[PDB]
Enzyme design. Structure first.
Site, PDB file in Angstrom:
ATOM      1  N   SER B   7     -39.398   7.891  15.228  1.00 30.13           N
ATOM      2  CA  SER B   7     -40.509   8.805  14.958  1.00 30.13           C
ATOM      3  C   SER B   7     -41.689   8.004  14.427  1.00 30.13           C
ATOM      4  CB  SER B   7     -40.081   9.857  13.930  1.00 30.13           C
ATOM      5  OG  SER B   7     -41.190  10.639  13.518  1.00 30.13           O
ATOM      6  N   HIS B  32     -40.999   8.805  19.686  1.00 29.02           N
ATOM      7  CA  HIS B  32     -41.268  10.203  19.370  1.00 29.02           C
ATOM      8  C   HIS B  32     -42.623  10.372  18.683  1.00 29.02           C
ATOM      9  CE1 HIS B  32     -39.926  14.349  18.999  1.00 29.02           C
ATOM     10  NE2 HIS B  32     -40.461  14.355  17.792  1.00 29.02           N
ATOM     11  N   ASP B  34     -45.184  12.820  16.941  1.00 29.08           N
ATOM     12  CA  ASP B  34     -45.370  14.110  16.289  1.00 29.08           C
ATOM     13  C   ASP B  34     -46.835  14.510  16.243  1.00 29.08           C
ATOM     14  OD1 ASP B  34     -42.748  15.070  15.283  1.00 29.08           O
ATOM     15  OD2 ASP B  34     -42.715  13.027  14.446  1.00 29.08           O
ATOM     16  N   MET B  36     -49.277  17.324  15.128  1.00 22.96           N
ATOM     17  CA  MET B  36     -49.385  18.465  14.214  1.00 22.96           C
ATOM     18  C   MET B  36     -50.859  18.819  14.020  1.00 22.96           C
ATOM     19  SD  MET B  36     -46.684  17.219  11.303  1.00 22.96           S
ATOM     20  CE  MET B  36     -45.160  16.283  11.694  1.00 22.96           C
ATOM     21  N   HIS B  65     -44.033  15.799  20.705  1.00 24.75           N
ATOM     22  CA  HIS B  65     -43.593  17.049  20.118  1.00 24.75           C
ATOM     23  C   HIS B  65     -44.830  17.781  19.580  1.00 24.75           C
ATOM     24  CE1 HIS B  65     -41.085  19.055  16.664  1.00 24.75           C
ATOM     25  NE2 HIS B  65     -41.597  19.930  17.506  1.00 24.75           N
ATOM     26  N   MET B  67     -46.416  20.347  17.531  1.00 27.99           N
ATOM     27  CA  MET B  67     -46.312  21.284  16.427  1.00 27.99           C
ATOM     28  C   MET B  67     -47.730  21.807  16.227  1.00 27.99           C
ATOM     29  SD  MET B  67     -43.665  19.143  14.074  1.00 27.99           S
ATOM     30  CE  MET B  67     -44.089  17.636  14.924  1.00 27.99           C
ATOM     31  N   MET B 140     -34.677  21.271  15.254  1.00 26.63           N
ATOM     32  CA  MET B 140     -35.214  20.657  14.037  1.00 26.63           C
ATOM     33  C   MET B 140     -34.129  20.721  12.973  1.00 26.63           C
ATOM     34  SD  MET B 140     -38.155  19.504  14.656  1.00 26.63           S
ATOM     35  CE  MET B 140     -38.450  19.018  12.965  1.00 26.63           C
ATOM     36  N   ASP B 174     -34.128  16.241  15.032  1.00 23.38           N
ATOM     37  CA  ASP B 174     -35.184  15.553  14.300  1.00 23.38           C
ATOM     38  C   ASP B 174     -35.248  16.050  12.872  1.00 23.38           C
ATOM     39  OD1 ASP B 174     -37.484  14.265  13.442  1.00 23.38           O
ATOM     40  OD2 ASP B 174     -38.843  15.466  14.642  1.00 23.38           O
ATOM     41  N   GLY B 175     -35.121  15.127  11.922  1.00 13.29           N
ATOM     42  CA  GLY B 175     -35.184  15.493  10.523  1.00 13.29           C
ATOM     43  C   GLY B 175     -34.026  14.943   9.706  1.00 13.29           C
TER      44      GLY B 175
END
EC number: 5.1.3.1
Lengths: 219, 219
Positions: B7, B32, B34, B36, B65, B67, B140, B174-175
């Site tokens: 990530s 990955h 992210d 947002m 991804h 978001m 998630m 993920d997380g």
């Protein structure tokens, strides 16, 4: 005083630290960081996490422009990230600009306010004249959201109005600034110049930075 | 097949090209990304302009991804930017999911769907079973928005349910994924592993990547 601030939105986002060093090496005064949330403007760029990583590599002044709907929620994150200047939009701070300016200053950042092309310049007068005022006004010279757009001369009237009323105020312009548009902006009274494509896309970026500075100083 | 996807939210955002390359050299299958927008989640990270610059420096699969509240508006920009995978959230793609999947695929990207902890796994079954279905489901394992949060074991029931019904589907988690939490996730059926702090904060990131892959392959 003249301040040339390359817009990092036009640099190689994948080699930011190197691009930042290169710009400072070439004469840049500040590095302009466009922060867009996809809501206030139809584009999403970078946020505080990026500013934080960049600050670990440079001591340069990071001039952050918040094209977001909720600037208040970015004060803490950006202050922690090491932002130097924090410029919010007048269009989304009509009910809390006084507290917003204070919260920015409390964190040691320089408060600034920006206005979109369609917003009358008189709207920012109260912010410049407040007990705790903005220390910079950013007159957008293109509709915010993307680089490479056409410079809007009509916005020079806002720059002129501000310079006339506030001779020592930092007046910044962003949108289509480059060798072909700097003279009219410098004459109008702009002293802080944000330029993207005209600098990064130039064969001689350092020469462009010097030319922009010379035009402002000449005025 | 096992896919390890570091990530980048946990990487040095100021040296993205170098970090991406280092991850690939160490064995990463995908990177990955992210994205947002400060609205769907309370954080703003990077957008298409960053993906576009990174693509100029890597041939790696960029697993993006989204978001964001309006994923449809990112399909064109991310396709142009070079995104490889485009994963939207089931919580904001309502009634438009069929069209969204088609638009993503029409632009040469791999469609995927993600679900927050509070969302029942059944919500995504129709997307996996559609004529033009998602090719990946991201469960998630923390509330999206920030790295370094605690893994939520209870989310493994979603992973298991998905693996039981769809034996060849890419199931991503993920997380909080790391050496201490991978076995339970691999046993549940997850084969695509997104990990941030456990890789970027490790003394031996290459060993961590290999360990994550080994656990998945062992299952």
């Amino acid at each position: 005083a003249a301040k040339i601030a390359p817009s990092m939105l036009s640099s190689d986002f994948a080699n930011l630290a190197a691009e930042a060093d290169r710009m400072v090496r070439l004469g840049a005064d500040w590095l302009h960081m466009d922060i867009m949330d996809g809501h206030f403007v139809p584009n999403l760029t970078i946020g505080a996490p990026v500013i934080q990583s960049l600050r670990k590599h440079t001591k340069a002044y990071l001039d952050c422009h918040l094209m977001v709907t909720n600037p208040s929620d970015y004060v803490e994150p950006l202050a922690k990230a090491g932002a130097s200047g924090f410029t919010f939009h007048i269009e989304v701070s009509r009910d809390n600009w006084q507290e917003l300016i204070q919260s920015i200053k409390a964190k040691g950042m320089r408060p600034g306010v920006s206005l979109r092309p369609g917003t009358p310049v008189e709207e920012v007068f109260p912010l410049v004249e407040a007990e705790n005022p903005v220390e910079l006004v950013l007159v957008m010279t293109v509709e915010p959201g993307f680089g490479g757009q056409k410079f809007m001369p009509e916005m020079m009237e806002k720059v002129r109005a501000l310079r006339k009323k506030y001779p020592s105020l930092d007046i910044e312009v962003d949108g289509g600034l480059g060798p072909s548009t700097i003279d009219v902006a410098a004459s109008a009274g702009a002293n802080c110049i944000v330029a993207g494509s005209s600098i990064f896309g130039a064969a001689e970026p350092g020469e462009v930075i010097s030319a922009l500075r010379k035009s402002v100083e000449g005025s």
